[PDB]
Symmetry: D2
Amino acid sequence: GKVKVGVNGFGRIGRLVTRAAFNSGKVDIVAINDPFIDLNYMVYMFQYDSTHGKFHGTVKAENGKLVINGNPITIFQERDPSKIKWGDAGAEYVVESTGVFTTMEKAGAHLQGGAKRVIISAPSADAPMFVMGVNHEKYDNSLKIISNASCTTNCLAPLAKVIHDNFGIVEGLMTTVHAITATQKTVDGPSGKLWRDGRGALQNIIPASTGAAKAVGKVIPELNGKLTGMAFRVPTANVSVVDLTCRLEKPAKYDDIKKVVKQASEGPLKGILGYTEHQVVSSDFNSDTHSSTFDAGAGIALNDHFVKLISWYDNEFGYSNRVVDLMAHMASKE
Amino acid sequence: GKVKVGVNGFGRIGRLVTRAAFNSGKVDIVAINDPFIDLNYMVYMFQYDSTHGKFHGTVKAENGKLVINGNPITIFQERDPSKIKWGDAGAEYVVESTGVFTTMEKAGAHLQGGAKRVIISAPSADAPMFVMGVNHEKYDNSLKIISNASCTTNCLAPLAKVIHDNFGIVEGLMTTVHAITATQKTVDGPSGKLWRDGRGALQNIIPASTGAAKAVGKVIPELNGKLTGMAFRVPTANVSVVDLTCRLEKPAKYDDIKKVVKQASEGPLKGILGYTEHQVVSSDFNSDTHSSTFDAGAGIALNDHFVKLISWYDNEFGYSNRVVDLMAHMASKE
Amino acid sequence: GKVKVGVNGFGRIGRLVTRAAFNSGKVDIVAINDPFIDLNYMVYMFQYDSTHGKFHGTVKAENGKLVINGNPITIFQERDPSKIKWGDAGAEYVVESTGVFTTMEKAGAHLQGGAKRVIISAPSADAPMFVMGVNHEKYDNSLKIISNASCTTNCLAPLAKVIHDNFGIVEGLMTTVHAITATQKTVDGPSGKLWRDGRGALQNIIPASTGAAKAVGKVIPELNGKLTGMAFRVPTANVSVVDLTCRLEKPAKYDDIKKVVKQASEGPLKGILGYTEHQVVSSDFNSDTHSSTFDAGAGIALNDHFVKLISWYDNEFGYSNRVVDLMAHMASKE
Amino acid sequence: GKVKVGVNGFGRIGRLVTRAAFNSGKVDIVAINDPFIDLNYMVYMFQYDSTHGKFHGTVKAENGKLVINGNPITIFQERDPSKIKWGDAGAEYVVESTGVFTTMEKAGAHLQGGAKRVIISAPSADAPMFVMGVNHEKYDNSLKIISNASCTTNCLAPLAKVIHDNFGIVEGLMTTVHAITATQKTVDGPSGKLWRDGRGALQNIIPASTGAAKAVGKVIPELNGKLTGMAFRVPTANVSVVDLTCRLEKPAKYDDIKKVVKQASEGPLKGILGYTEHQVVSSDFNSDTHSSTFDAGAGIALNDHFVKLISWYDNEFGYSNRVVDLMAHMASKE
């Protein structure tokens, strides 16, 4: 019943997606492709994680196949995506997580190998974007290549949708305090395009830009041209926070905002948007599957039309779980 | 000619103030009071600094007096401020930096010891607030107890003043990414009032509140009731950044904002407000004496009436240098 | 059947001991004493942990009692240990974890309250020391006040015992790379006795001394006067590593050492001393209950009589689990 | 009079070598080669440093030449070392700091371009090794390709030489607590050979091996086959520490060791080996030009024949200054 999924690239996103798929069980992984990691290294990388701890289960290599919880997984080492025999392994959906094939033309090479549909775990210039709980009902099954946007967009979209539906956002600017990523340098190093990104990650705030706020307009058409922002990269490990400053049409006291956010988090957006009133910190959301958790006590309102909202999100676990959920919904809609 | 200054408390602020006074030479330190630090420990603490490096000069203890660059300094160990013989040591001005005597009544005990005026290096509930380059011309010499506000207020005030003068701020919300301070815990520890502040500083974002934006209204009367914000405490070492989101009356393209900020930084606010167009990071402002440096490339504008401005500031060196400058101006006005 | 245990002090060690007792179920906690933490703060502190994550269970306050997994716990706020009514709450054993009552006379005040035996979770000047798996068979039930030494001693004792039994250690020097603790300063701060310990923990190696190696001689009488060492405090979070350099009597190739260590870890010291041959790092031992894990690949041997052995240990979870195990063994011996 | 020096590669070592050469003035840099950094990026990278602060001087680009303090510097972008026109730029000595041409045959390609001698800033399999203050008198001018070993070897060699000369080391094992380097990963990443080195540098101790102790035997022939050790990589920034455990022939109390080390540091090894008795930490040696500083208070001695010695060293500034000093001595010997 569950759809067969193949993963391209065994980086951070690919490993986390495999972990989420095996933890939730909504889909079955049957093939992985990576031209620079061998089988034993794959076992070592999957077994041990610095951020999320040891894998809860059994992983081993046998007969040239990665066996996780007794499920053999075919391993490929092709560099050209058009040469990967996805159909032979039985994979129906393919997750493109390498981060280098983001356009529709580049990502469509996987279709030649026998895959039916391709999901891009990154923003795409021309592929359609879907965010779970916001516009995933727009999927009609006639699209072969889509996109899951990014972690920041997935965190910002549900809260922005609720706020716009209840009070009518007029314009907003977003600032996100982000954790370090794999593109940063351990010590001040060489950067070709972004000079700031080449500086030492352990001792530099390194202010950075981001197009997630713009992409929210793509996900929600009514908010097109009304959002934008930047980002800061602090020397933390896993958890990021989003800060949204927006102007509302209708008057909205902070208690009303809290009530509507809690109501949305309970019924319609259960498991996607969280709500908390405790004195939480960043480490309290490690390995949390929510796309975004609204922090009631951290926000502040200048008046009835000018507020600042704070939302937490795990940029590793939440995005992978959202990718798995999107694949499951796509399989159900088939 | 230079006024004689006595320092109460040898914490971070007191040590940095002494260092700034000896580096610039605008004032002379002639007495220090601390009931928990002895002479040899004082020499050790002043000589070595983890953030700003070794002191450039000579410091030693002789005859029960701290000698810095050949200048003897009287040392007191009184716990009650009313019992300190400030007049005997020749100190005219006293810097109250312990952080526990912030009200006018509590801080006035130093006057009984023979001091002429008292400067509080922290926000005060009832003492007048002065920020160098913003409203320091309002000092009239008839005030015996004043205040220098805080680092965040000193960073926000000049940029806000320039923006209000040129374009008429209507309302703004501020977010500051702050470095760790002495009030935080090395590991998750016990906190009586602020539960979030008791969590581990090395692994927690610990969102925190701040009244610096409100205090800007006190410093600039026209902006009363139009500013507010919060703060985030990231596990960095020394440098903080301020993010201001505001709505303007007159239309203002980003180039016009940059031009006016540069013009202000050059002539009127020279040495107080900086300007840069390079790809700088947080560590590039270590040991910088400016109150705030405008980052042209980091900001973003949604439209002609909604912008986000970014300013850097060293929360240790800049505040101490501002305190020294305020004391020098007070002495000149005498 | 399980003995009733009362905990004095709700610091890091006390909270971790309560967590270990509720996770393993070998003993039952029925009373906690802390004069500076109220009930709601206790619930907040127990529920959330930055290092070990959220508590797996339910914790709440009701009728002035802390309820964990449905088990009510009496709460005391006495400051004088002699005034705590341990007998009224039904507590038989008391764990003294405040770190200020370490002598037999000071720790014996708990006996006046009705407690039968007292266990000190820290080194004691005169109380007997017991390490699980090394000399815990020497407990004879006639002792009312004992000690569990420390984390470093608990890590060093089993490996040293095995090495001495198999090859006859002649003399050794130990170096431990330790994680930051609650006694360190978030930023360079004031230290009364240890000047080095007052420096900034996030940016300083802060070399420190330690008497754990000496205490190993107390635990193992044959090694008296043959061990000693120092420590380094690096800006990590939870996991520490011990490095032992020793000279052996009998010739011992590295393979023989590995074989004997593995054999000891399997049968006799199961669950106390671990063994691994993988390429592990410090974060791979987070929340590990072993007292020490031997790292086969990290060690090196100059010749047949001069070797360096490496052992990992979680200084928070392992010590608490050892305390619980010692209490269970004491109850069994009753 | 000063020799003309050309630098191959503008990495960390090359930039630090250029900075040291311009700060001390013992040599003149007249050419730099890097195929992946352009002129403007070179100016940006040289001007700003996260660890050592802003460059004290003026650096700018004009007419395709890097101008530092008014001295133009020719810039090359060749990838093949044999095609670099070292002779045209007037460079006599060439510093090979890329880390990929370490053998004599590979490093000799620079001779075809017109260079007279080549200095390798890294360990070499077959090139002769020289350490300033230990065996640099063995240079006879007939060698065209040599080596400066490494930072760890440069720290260990002088102290080991003094100890062997005064007391006769029999055998020793070394452990070094090292800071993070450019070869580490910002977050757990892919490592081809060293699996441990691919783990997250900000949250992992990552135990590592090192051949510096072995190379000490090459530098000091009498100690061949008597030294070896390993290393630990902690999440610090710049400063490392060396721990040496050795057995001595003659009896040696700790006071005698301190006296001999101080005497050596004063006269013969002035500026190479330091001596301190203060309560220093790692950050106190930032931007220190000494090869190694002996920490009197941190060491410990079990008996008269078994001691542990502690030495600090800046692995960035000290090595670069030693390279400059070696080049100056080579020029003088010409």
